[PDB]
């Protein structure tokens, strides 16, 4: 794509890259384990749009945060289970987790991490029985990101197109 980017485009790329990112991370994980696995390869799957430059973004992010994720993933679900959030306070809780994480600051590593645990927390409720949490989580993420000045940060770092300019690029 082209250089530069505004919060407007950042939001769209965020949701897209978010779904694709979590999709890849969990995709490769399905081989090793099945923790918080998706709804099987079907219509309920995560039909991402890898045809765009964003497609490569999620993949890369999953790599730089692959070991890190799985590393603190086992424990992530452990404590997450002790939470047991709801669809009413879903955002009330999520917003807290992120705010507490990015509280120290904002960095490429923090962004990827947010999504890593994001999908987990989402599926946690979805599989629990609250069918239809994917959209809720995604919406809260994009809204929280564009509210926590996150979008602006990403745009300054070179939008989501900067992922290819990272470690494994």
């Amino acid at each position: 794509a082209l250089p530069s980017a505004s919060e407007e485009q950042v939001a769209q790329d965020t949701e897209e890259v978010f779904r694709s990112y979590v999709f890849y991370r969990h995709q490769q994980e399905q081989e090793a384990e099945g923790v918080a696995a998706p709804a099987d390869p079907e219509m309920v799957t995560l039909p991402l749009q890898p045809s765009s430059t964003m497609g490569q973004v999620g993949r890369q992010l999953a790599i730089i945060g692959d070991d890190i994720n799985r590393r603190y993933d086992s424990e992530f679900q452990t404590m997450l289970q002790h939470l047991q959030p709801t669809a009413e306070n879903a955002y009330e809780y999520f917003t807290k987790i992120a705010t507490s994480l990015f509280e120290s600051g904002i960095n490429w590593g923090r962004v990827v991490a947010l999504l890593g645990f994001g999908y987990r927390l989402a599926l946690h409720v979805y599989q629990h029985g609250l069918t239809g949490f994917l959209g809720q989580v995604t919406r809260f993420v994009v809204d929280f990101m564009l509210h926590h000045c996150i979008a602006r940060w990403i745009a300054q770092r070179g939008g989501w197109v900067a992922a290819l300019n990272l470690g494994n690029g």
């Binding site: 070991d67 890190i68 994720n69 404590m79 507490s100 990015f102 590593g109 991490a113």
Partner: peptide, 22 residues
């Protein structure tokens, strides 16, 4: 309660270390 601070204190650990491993 203990989870409210724990769930946040546990993420002391996913934000940083990737940025340095990239």
């Amino acid at each position: 309660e203990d989870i409210i601070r724990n769930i946040a204190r546990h993420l002391a650990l996913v934000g940083d270390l990737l940025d340095r491993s990239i």
